[PDB]
Amino acid sequence: VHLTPEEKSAVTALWGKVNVDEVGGEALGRLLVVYPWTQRFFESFGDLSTPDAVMGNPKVKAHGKKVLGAFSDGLAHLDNLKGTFATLSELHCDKLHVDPENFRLLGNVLVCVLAHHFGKEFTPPVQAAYQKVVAGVANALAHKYH
Amino acid sequence: VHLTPEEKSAVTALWGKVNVDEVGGEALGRLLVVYPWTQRFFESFGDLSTPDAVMGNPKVKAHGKKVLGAFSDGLAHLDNLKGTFATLSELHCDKLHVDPENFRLLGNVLVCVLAHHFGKEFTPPVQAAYQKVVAGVANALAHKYH
Amino acid sequence: VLSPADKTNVKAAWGKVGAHAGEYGAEALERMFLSFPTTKTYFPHFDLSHGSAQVKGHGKKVADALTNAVAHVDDMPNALSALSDLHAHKLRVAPVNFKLLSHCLLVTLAAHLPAEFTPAVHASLDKFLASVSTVLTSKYR
Amino acid sequence: VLSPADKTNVKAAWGKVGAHAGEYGAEALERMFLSFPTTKTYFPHFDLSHGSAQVKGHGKKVADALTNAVAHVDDMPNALSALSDLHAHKLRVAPVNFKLLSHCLLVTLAAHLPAEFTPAVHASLDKFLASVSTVLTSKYR
Numbered sequence: 001v002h003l004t005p006e007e008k009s010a011v012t013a014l015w016g017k018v019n020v021d022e023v024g025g026e027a028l029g030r031l032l033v034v035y036p037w038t039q040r041f042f043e044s045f046g047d048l049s050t051p052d053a054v055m056g057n058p059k060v061k062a063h064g065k066k067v068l069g070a071f072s073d074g075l076a077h078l079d080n081l082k083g084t085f086a087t088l089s090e091l092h093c094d095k096l097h098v099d100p101e102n103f104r105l106l107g108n109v110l111v112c113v114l115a116h117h118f119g120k121e122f123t124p125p126v127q128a129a130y131q132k133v134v135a136g137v138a139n140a141l142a143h144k145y146h
Numbered sequence: 147v148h149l150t151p152e153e154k155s156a157v158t159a160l161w162g163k164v165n166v167d168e169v170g171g172e173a174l175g176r177l178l179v180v181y182p183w184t185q186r187f188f189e190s191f192g193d194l195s196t197p198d199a200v201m202g203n204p205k206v207k208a209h210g211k212k213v214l215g216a217f218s219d220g221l222a223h224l225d226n227l228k229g230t231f232a233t234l235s236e237l238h239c240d241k242l243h244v245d246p247e248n249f250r251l252l253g254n255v256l257v258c259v260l261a262h263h264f265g266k267e268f269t270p271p272v273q274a275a276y277q278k279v280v281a282g283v284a285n286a287l288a289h290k291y292h
Numbered sequence: 293v294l295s296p297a298d299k300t301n302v303k304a305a306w307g308k309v310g311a312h313a314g315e316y317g318a319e320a321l322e323r324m325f326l327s328f329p330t331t332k333t334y335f336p337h338f339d340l341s342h343g344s345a346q347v348k349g350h351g352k353k354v355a356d357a358l359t360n361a362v363a364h365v366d367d368m369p370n371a372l373s374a375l376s377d378l379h380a381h382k383l384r385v386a387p388v389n390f391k392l393l394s395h396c397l398l399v400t401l402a403a404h405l406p407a408e409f410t411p412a413v414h415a416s417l418d419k420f421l422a423s424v425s426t427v428l429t430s431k432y433r
Numbered sequence: 434v435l436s437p438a439d440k441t442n443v444k445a446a447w448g449k450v451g452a453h454a455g456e457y458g459a460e461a462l463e464r465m466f467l468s469f470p471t472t473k474t475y476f477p478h479f480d481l482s483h484g485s486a487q488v489k490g491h492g493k494k495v496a497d498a499l500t501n502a503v504a505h506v507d508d509m510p511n512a513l514s515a516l517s518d519l520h521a522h523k524l525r526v527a528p529v530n531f532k533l534l535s536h537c538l539l540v541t542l543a544a545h546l547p548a549e550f551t552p553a554v555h556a557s558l559d560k561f562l563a564s565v566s567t568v569l570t571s572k573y574r
């Protein structure tokens with residue numbers, strides 16, 4: 001993905017200010033809540049019977065941090081997302097067989113989590129910079145389907 | 147895209163037998179008929195008021211051959227679809243701003259045209275080889291959105 | 293939302309297919325498993341090999357659900373009620389898979405009815421499958 | 434298909450938004466034009482610059498169509514009739530764009546109502562927008 005200098009600024013700026021211990025479980029949790037069919041890949045996490053039960057689930061929060069670690073890393077290597085996500089693509093595509101399209105949903109849920117947390121700060125232009133990132137990562141994570 | 151030897155065989159085989167003067171206008175025509183919103187990019191082609199009027203339209207048939215020429219070429223360079231479709235991507239993405247997802251529809255309409263024409267010959271396994279090709283080309287044509 | 297012309301085109305298509313319905317339904321599934329591998333995980337206990345009696349028996353079940361849908365085209369929601377519940381609530385079948393299967397169902401017909409698969413009929417069928425898929429994904433918990 | 438809980442969650446969301454509806458509708462459009470550029474070609478004659486009075490006036494029109502949809506939630510097809518005709522028949526707005534705009538509408542609310550945008554409410558709204566979008570794309574010629 002190629003972000004112009006202003007787009008890079010807008011993303012690095014807000015991202016430096018993200019609580020890496022919560023944003024990830026929040027986006028993953030909302031995904032499970034907003035798109036229920038995704039729970040099929042987490043039968044092992046336990047109680048996902050209610051939104052509060054999903055949001056408060058420890059495994060969700062724990063796994064969300066990893067997912068988040070994946071994005072921070074993606075941001076660190078935009079000019080080369082393919083090589084970066086190669087391994088996560090083999091897992092998500094070849095082992096997991098994650099339904100096509102799920103990666104973009106989560107990116108978009110991530111974007112919703114970012115807006116909710118930052119509010120006014122997540123300006124239309126700031127959001128635009130993140131849709132590119134999310135799309136670069138979702139595309140890269142799906143390279144085994146290419 | 148990486149087709150195994152058997153997948154390559156299945157695609158080259160049927161493809162050698164394709165009437166390059168008709169298949170292209172057929173897939174493009176059906177696209178305009180099946181997904182009407184795509185006519186917005188062809189207000190200049192003339193009478194697209196009816197399926198027969200669309201299917202019999204000269205400009206459609208003429209333009210369909212080009213599109214087809216694009217696929218034949220794609221097939222000729224599978225291990226490298228990006229570099230091959232680079233120019234068509236700038237046109238379709240940066241100039242045209244073709245709605246995201248349209249490229250896959252046409253590939254899928256192409257696949258329907260191939261089945262209709264070959265029938266029994268377009269075996270489930272033969273179709274599988276073509277969905278990969280169609281997906282490799284649609285992905286490549288959308289590199290400006292990556 | 294399925295014009296009269298579409299209902300006529302679909303009904304005509306159903307007639308031509310005649311008794312081959314089940315066979316063609318089994319073919320569309322096979323085509324989907326091969327073309328879109330990820331769909332396979334929804335059938336872990338099924339043997340998806342060519343000629344599988346289970347895929348055969350199931351393609352017949354799909355075909356009967358589509359015929360029931362057309363036989364009651366003006367009110368698919370009520371007719372496909374138990375199936376929407378089944379696919380969304382229990383199976384957790386993601387929405388994209390319905391698009392994948394519909395395409396295969398269309399490819400299967402194009403390959404067996406060159407005469408009836410005209411541009412108009414192709415369009416109508418696509419709308420029919422789109423309508424059935426919309427119902428099957430209306431019940432997400 | 435919009436459970437009672439969803440209707441309640443959406444209605445509650447509408448209340449909180451109050452009079453800011455138009456402003457937020459204009460914001461969602463701006464967000465869409467910036468995030469999904471291809472959508473812009475649908476508004477060639479519009480000035481899409483920030484603070485555009487046209488984008489402002491139009492975001493108010495969108496907001497009123499969503500409120501009319503909720504005010505008549507049990508029968509959106511009939512209420513959104515003229516708009517489905519407009520977007521599908523005349524405008525030729527492809528289906529994917531409704532998904533793009535819905536997302537921006539959700540991002541816009543999350544950014545203005547941290548209290549009401551809980552996981553449950555987010556899910557309900559998404560279903561609401563999905564339902565409205567389904568109606569707006571039921572009339573493809």
Ligand code: HEM
Pocket residue numbers: 038039041042066067069070071088091092096098102103104106107137138141
């Ligand atoms: C674009 C967003 C995504 C990113 C960046 C991502 C990232 C991650 C990371 C970093 C891991 C752990 C990898 C490891 O332990 O080696 C993982 C595991 C996993 N992901 Fe994702 N993921 C994404 C989307 C999804 C989606 C949509 C699903 C499907 C609902 C999914 C299902 C899983 C599952 C089930 C695991 C557990 C794998 C295991 O521990 O064996 N992921 N993901």
Ligand code: HEM
Pocket residue numbers: 184185187188212213215216217234237238242244248249250252253283284287
């Ligand atoms: C994946 C399928 C597609 C392929 C391979 C493809 C291929 C082509 C080719 C080879 C050309 C002519 C390029 C040139 O003259 O330099 C072209 C032009 C064009 N395509 Fe496509 N195309 C695809 C999809 C689409 C779709 C979905 C739309 C949108 C409805 C679209 C809209 C156009 C238009 C309007 C032109 C005319 C450009 C001009 O002559 O100025 N194409 N396409």
Ligand code: HEM
Pocket residue numbers: 331334335353354357358375378379383385389390391393424425428
């Ligand atoms: C127009 C599309 C479809 C129709 C009409 C349809 C129809 C059916 C029918 C009638 C059954 C039998 C249920 C019963 O025994 O009562 C069924 C079950 C099932 N369907 Fe579908 N279906 C469709 C698409 C899908 C898709 C897209 C998937 C996933 C890719 C899916 C996955 C399944 C599974 C896994 C079962 C249970 C099979 C078993 O465990 O025996 N269906 N479907």
Ligand code: HEM
Pocket residue numbers: 472475476494495498499516519520524526530531532534565566569
């Ligand atoms: C929930 C989603 C949407 C709602 C409720 C909605 C609502 C409206 C309303 C109420 C109008 C005013 C029509 C009139 O003056 O009678 C309109 C027109 C229009 N809409 Fe939408 N719309 C939505 C999504 C879209 C999308 C996704 C696009 C394309 C990306 C689109 C493109 C347009 C255009 C181009 C016009 C005509 C504007 C003009 O030329 O003045 N709409 N819409």
